[PDB]
Amino acid sequence: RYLLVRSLQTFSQAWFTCRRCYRGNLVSIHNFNINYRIQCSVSALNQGQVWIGGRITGSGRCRRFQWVDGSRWNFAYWAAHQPWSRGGHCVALCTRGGYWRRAHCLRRLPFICSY
């Protein structure tokens, strides 16, 4: 299950909210059918995107893409043209098109929790 939190929060604040207000986690997405369903759930928002639970971790050359809910990173739906290098280490889903974009973790956005 998943739900939309309309409140604007940083990725870290949102990670906390999903865990404490809903006993869940910022959502992980493993296939297009679920990405589309979440896309539909946020289509009418005035904000351009919402936090999902993805993060780029590590230092130096070798890093990893992880879901805060620990699930495997086996699917993505990245916007083809977006600032990438130095674009941020948190992942957001665009309300229009359902594409994912890297975004700076300290920016505040609405978000999706799974429970």
> For residue 102, what are the CA distances in angstroms to 20, 21, 22, 23, 24?
25, 25, 25, 26, 22
Instruction: Say how far apart CA 50 and CA 4 lie, in whole Å.
Output: 9
State both tokens at 92.
């957001």
Smallest Cα–Cα separation from 53: which of 16, 98, 6? 16
In total, how many domains does the chain have?
A: 1
Amino acid symbol at 97? G
Site of tokens 């043209």: 81
Q: What are phi and psi of 17, to 5 degrees?
A: -55, -45
CB 36 within 8 A of CB 110: no
User: Is the Cβ–Cβ distance between 53 and 67 less than 8 Å?
Assistant: yes
Experimental method: X-ray
Strand partners, 94: 49
Resolution rounded to one decimal, in angstroms = 1.8
Give residue 36's domain range: 1-115
In this structure, what CATH number is given to the domain that contains residue 12?
Answer: 3.10.100.10
**Which among 115, 97, 106 is positioned nearest to 8, based on CA atoms?**
106
